[PDB]
Each structure stands twice: as C-alpha cells, then as structure tokens.
Point group: C3
Chain length 145, copies 3
Amino acid sequence: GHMIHKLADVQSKNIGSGTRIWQFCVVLPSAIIGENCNICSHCFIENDVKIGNNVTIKCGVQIWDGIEIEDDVFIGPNVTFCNDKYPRSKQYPKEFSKTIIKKGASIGANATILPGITIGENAMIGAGAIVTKDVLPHVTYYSKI
Amino acid sequence: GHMIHKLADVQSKNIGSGTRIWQFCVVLPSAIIGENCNICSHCFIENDVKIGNNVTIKCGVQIWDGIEIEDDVFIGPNVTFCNDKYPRSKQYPKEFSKTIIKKGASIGANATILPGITIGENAMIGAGAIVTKDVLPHVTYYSKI
Amino acid sequence: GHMIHKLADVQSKNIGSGTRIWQFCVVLPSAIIGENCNICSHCFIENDVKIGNNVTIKCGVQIWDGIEIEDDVFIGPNVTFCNDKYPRSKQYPKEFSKTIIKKGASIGANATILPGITIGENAMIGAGAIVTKDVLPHVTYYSKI
Ligand SMILES: CC(C)(COP(=O)(O)OP(=O)(O)OC[C@H]1O[C@@H](n2cnc3c(N)ncnc32)[C@H](O)[C@@H]1OP(=O)(O)O)[C@@H](O)C(=O)NCCC(=O)NCCS
Ligand SMILES: CC(C)(COP(=O)(O)OP(=O)(O)OC[C@H]1O[C@@H](n2cnc3c(N)ncnc32)[C@H](O)[C@@H]1OP(=O)(O)O)[C@@H](O)C(=O)NCCC(=O)NCCS
Ligand SMILES: CC(C)(COP(=O)(O)OP(=O)(O)OC[C@H]1O[C@@H](n2cnc3c(N)ncnc32)[C@H](O)[C@@H]1OP(=O)(O)O)[C@@H](O)C(=O)NCCC(=O)NCCS
Ligand SMILES: CC(=O)N[C@H]1[C@@H](O)[C@@H](C)O[C@H](OP(=O)(O)OP(=O)(O)OC[C@H]2O[C@@H](n3cc(C)c(=O)[nH]c3=O)C[C@@H]2O)[C@@H]1O
Ligand SMILES: CC(=O)N[C@H]1[C@@H](O)[C@@H](C)O[C@H](OP(=O)(O)OP(=O)(O)OC[C@H]2O[C@@H](n3cc(C)c(=O)[nH]c3=O)C[C@@H]2O)[C@@H]1O
Ligand SMILES: CC(=O)N[C@H]1[C@@H](O)[C@@H](C)O[C@H](OP(=O)(O)OP(=O)(O)OC[C@H]2O[C@@H](n3cc(C)c(=O)[nH]c3=O)C[C@@H]2O)[C@@H]1O
Ligand code: NA
Ligand code: NA
Ligand code: NA
C-alpha cells in the first residue's frame, strides 16, 4: 500500500504502492500519483495532475491543474509552477496552459517554472532559476546572477 | 457567510461574505479580509493587515504586519513580502515599513516584494521578479535573467 | 520551558527554553534548537540539524540534514537551503553537503542558498538572492536584477 500522514488531507484514491505523502499536504480527488513517490510536507496537488513513479517533490511545492510530472523527476523545495501567463483575479482561463517535466529531469530549490513549459528528459534546472523557455533534454539551465 | 476550512487556524472575525480560507492557513485576530477572497492553503496572515474584495492569494504566501492588498489583486504562489529592510534577529522595528498592492495588480509566482513598496493599479509583476522599486500603474515588470 | 503549538508535529526533545514553534511545523527527532528561537508557521526541520540561540526562522523555510544555523541568525520567509548539488530522484548522497550560517547573519526573504555554503558572521543576504559562493563576514550580498 501507500503511506498518507494523518496530518495530510489526501482526497485522491489514485496513489501508487510505496508512495509517501507527508504532513500538511493537500491532494485533490482527481490527482494521479504513481508508485514510490515522496510528497514532502506542505505541498498542494490539484485535480488535473499526473505524477509518475519514483517522483520526489520536496516541501512547499504546488502542482496545479495542467501540470504533468513524468517518472523519476526531482522537484526541489519551494519550486513554483504555473498555468496562467497573464493572471488576473477571478478571470479564469477557458483552458489552463500545460507544463510537462519529462522523465528523470531535476528542478533545483526555489526555481520558477513559467506556464506552457516543457523541461526535457534528464534536464537539470539550477536553484533559483526562472524558466521562461523550454529546456532541452539533458541540458543544465540556470539564471545569470 | 464565509468558508473557513476545519484545518485552518483563523482567529479573525473580520472576514467578508464569500471568502474561502483553505487548509493550513493561519490568520491572526486583527486581519481584515474583504468579500469573495480565496486564501489558498499554507498562507500566513498577520494582524496589521488589510485585504480588499475579490483578492486571490495562492498557496505559500505570508502577508505581514504593514502590508495592504487592495481589491481584485492576484498574488501568485510562494510570493514573499517584507516589512524590515535590514533584518536582525530580535531587533524589532519601532515601525514596520508599509507595502501597498493597489487595485487589480497581479504578482507572479515566487516574486519577492521588498519592504516600503507600492505596486500600482493593474500592474503585472513577472514570475520570480525581485521588486526593489515601486512599479507604476499598469506596468509589466520582470527581473532580467 | 518552550511553546510547541498543538498544530505542530515536533518530535525533538532537544529544544531550548523560550523557543516558540508555530502551527504546521515539522521537527524531526534529532534536531537541536537553542533558547529563545522563533520557528514560524509552515517550517520543516530535519534530523542532522543544529540551530543556536535567538534564531528567527520565518514561515515556509526548510532546514535539511547538513544545515547548521548559529546564534542570532535571521532567516527570512520562503528561504531555501540545500544539501545536494546534482539532485536526482532516489540517488541518495553517501554524505550530505554541509551549509553553515554563522552567528548574527541575516538571509532575506525568498533567498536561495546552494549546498556547501558558508555565510559569514553578521552577513546580510538580499531578498531573492541566489548564493552560489561563500559570503564573507559582515558583507551585504544580493543578486543583480
Ligand atoms: C546548476 C548546478 C547544477 C550547476 O553546478 P555546476 O555545473 O557544478 O556549476 P558551477 O558550480 O561550476 O558554477 C558555474 C557557474 O555558474 C554559476 N551558477 C551555478 N549554479 C547557479 C545557479 N543555480 N544560479 C545562478 N548561477 C549559478 C556559478 O556561480 C558559477 O559562476 P562563475 O563561473 O562565474 O564562478 C548547481 O549549481 C545547482 O544549482 N544545483 C541545484 C541544487 C539544488 O537545488 N538541489 C536540490 C535541493 S538540495
Ligand atoms: C511577465 C509576463 C507577463 C510577460 O509575458 P510577455 O509580456 O508575453 O513576455 P514574453 O513571453 O514575450 O517574454 C519577453 C521576454 O521577457 C522574458 N521574460 C518574460 N517573463 C519573464 C519573467 N517572469 N522573468 C524574467 N524574464 C521574463 C522572456 O524570456 C522574453 O525574453 P526574450 O525577449 O529574450 O526572448 C509573463 O512572462 C509572466 O511572468 N507571467 C506571470 C505568470 C504567473 O506567475 N502567473 C501566476 C501563477 S500561474
Ligand atoms: C540587500 C539590502 C539590505 C540592500 O539595501 P541597501 O543597501 O539600502 O541598498 P539600496 O536600497 O540602496 O539599493 C542599492 C541597489 O541595489 C539594488 N538592490 C537592493 N536590494 C536588492 C536585492 N535584494 N536584490 C537585487 N537588487 C537589490 C537596488 O535596486 C539598488 O539598485 P540601483 O543602485 O540600481 O538603484 C536590501 O535591499 C534587502 O534586500 N533587504 C532584505 C529585506 C528582507 O528580505 N527582510 C526580511 C523579510 S522582511
Ligand atoms: C534538500 C533536498 O531536497 N535533498 C534531497 C535529495 O538529496 C534527494 C536525492 O534525497 C533526499 O530527498 P527525499 O525526499 O527522496 O528524502 P527521503 O530520505 O526519501 O525522505 C525524507 C524526506 O521526507 C519528507 N518527510 C519525512 C518525514 C519523516 C516527515 O515527517 N515529513 C516529511 O516531509 C522530507 C524529508 O526530507 C534529500 O532530502
Ligand atoms: C497557478 C495559479 O495560481 N493559477 C490561478 C489563476 O489562473 C487564477 C485566475 O485562477 C485560479 O486561482 P483561484 O485561487 O482563483 O482558483 P479557484 O478555482 O477559485 O480555487 C481553487 C484554488 O483554491 C485553493 N484550494 C482549493 C481547495 C478545493 C482546497 O482544498 N484547498 C485549496 O487551497 C487552491 C486552488 O488552486 C488558478 O489557480
Ligand atoms: C517579515 C519579517 O520577517 N519581519 C520580521 C523582522 O522584522 C523581525 C526582526 O521581527 C519579526 O519577526 P519575529 O518572527 O521575530 O516576530 P515576533 O514578533 O517575535 O513573532 C511573530 C511571528 O511569529 C510567528 N507566528 C506567530 C503567531 C502568533 C502564530 O500564530 N503563528 C506564527 O507563525 C509569525 C509571526 O510573524 C518580523 O516578523
Ligand atoms: Na487573465
Ligand atoms: Na534591523
Ligand atoms: Na545525484
């Protein structure tokens, strides 16, 4: 089976064997999470969400509607995603922009992923990076400081 | 009335009709929150705080003493604010620096708002931006990467 | 004694007099926390962790295995740390990289601290900074925007 912490609010039944979901996580009903994932404390996971097997999501991350995470992905702490390029309060998109983080990619701590983004297989996103364009497979990207 | 999630700690009675406050939020007694707001999971809202109507605060945001949010503002996930330009542990300011986010402005995911800042009506702050100076009304600002 | 909020999960007994640990914090058993600390809501503190006296950790911060915080340090909200320079899901380091934040240093809101980093005594890290190199004692560092 899987481990859902008593201090998490997990509403999805679509959770793979070996997955751990930690304290103060919210997971909404339609989320799909594969096997042997680690969803660390203080994460939010919405409905139109697919997360593969062996995915690590460190603390303080939100996976919105329109975000897909493939197998073997690492997401660092306080990483953000997004599904709305020009957000205005109460102006709901007719269709959320999709992001996909492809198999084996890693996203460093506190990176910011713009909407509509593909990060290729086995890419490495530097800590604190702002990703405004697709990142090719196996590429190391970071923002110049 | 308003919706306070059972897994939130909301101590303020000053909350407008239609407002939703989600799991694992903390709202301290003197906070004022208007009507039809959405305070998403994992937010902290302090005492000397005014939030208008139709405000969206996405997950993982803290609204400190000295921060005012006007009507129709969008605040993206993991956005930070601040009320102390030269912070030192246990050195409490005599007066917190004030920030105001004016009506209809939007702040992108993981943006950082320095203390003493005005963001003008209907401004758009890019995801991951560091805002060290006021942003004029209706201006799109982002940090060069 | 110390104050552990009923809505925190604090598993460590190694907590100094006068320390406050707030709602929705997780503190694992081996963490050491000194006297008169303030661990604000939504923090995660791991096992191989030493935090000194009079330390302020604002909301939304994680202190990982391998991180030491000395006395009188201020850590701003949504700051990230890290102990793995080339993270890949399920590829556990044989030894976590160590970070030390030396006495009296301050780290601004939403800063990102790379692994293996020393921040010197009384340094000041700008809000949103990415710290990829040691910061000398008493130096003010920020990332060019
Ligand atoms: C991107 C990364 C993999 C690069 O490592 P690297 O290729 O060994 O690069 P180097 O350390 O040799 O740095 C090369 C240059 O890039 C800069 N740089 C490295 N990482 C950077 C980052 N994340 N953001 C901005 N600049 C960065 C360095 O300052 C250095 O600049 P210089 O040549 O002017 O001295 C690494 O720095 C990183 O960000 N890792 C992610 C860590 C993380 O978040 N892990 C999960 C949580 S623990
Ligand atoms: C700022 C923003 C509105 C700009 O959109 P835009 O005006 O269409 O700009 P473009 O996509 O045409 O990009 C123009 C340039 O600015 C850069 N840029 C855009 N947004 C940026 C950002 N947030 N930070 C740094 N650079 C950015 C692009 O890389 C591009 O560079 P180039 O000309 O060298 O190719 C948008 O990118 C953004 O950040 N939106 C906020 C999304 C968000 O956080 N929503 C809430 C959560 S879903
Ligand atoms: C770094 C800091 C201490 C510098 O303050 P300062 O020395 O008075 O510097 P100034 O305000 O005079 O700014 C000098 C320049 O650096 C830039 N700058 C200042 N802080 C910056 C930051 N954090 N990131 C990027 N640039 C910054 C300014 O835009 C200004 O640029 P300019 O000369 O082109 O106009 C302050 O800006 C800061 O970041 N404080 C931390 C606030 C915080 O996070 N507190 C805890 C939460 S409330
Ligand atoms: C800083 C960082 O992200 N480093 C990671 C990287 O090196 C990576 C390759 O391995 C580790 O990440 P994992 O999440 O896979 O660690 P693991 O040892 O499987 O699980 C411990 C994590 O679980 C989460 N957790 C654990 C417990 C016991 C808890 O109560 N609440 C909880 O949220 C957070 C812990 O860091 C490291 O933490
Ligand atoms: C990524 C992003 O910020 N996009 C937003 C933007 O497009 C914006 C214009 O609309 C949406 O934001 P809202 O917060 O207004 O969404 P809404 O549909 O009103 O409410 C769903 C949000 O409520 C919060 N929520 C919801 C539930 C059911 C919950 O259990 N816990 C909870 O925290 C987080 C959800 O994303 C989008 O999420
Ligand atoms: C924006 C910022 O970090 N500014 C700080 C800086 O000026 C610094 C020098 O002083 C203050 O930080 P402290 O954390 O030391 O504030 P303090 O007055 O001791 O405690 C209030 C904080 O405690 C935390 N807290 C408090 C209560 C009552 C709670 O329910 N849940 C809780 O998480 C968050 C509050 O901001 C300021 O908040
Ligand atoms: Na819009
Ligand atoms: Na000070
Ligand atoms: Na590795």
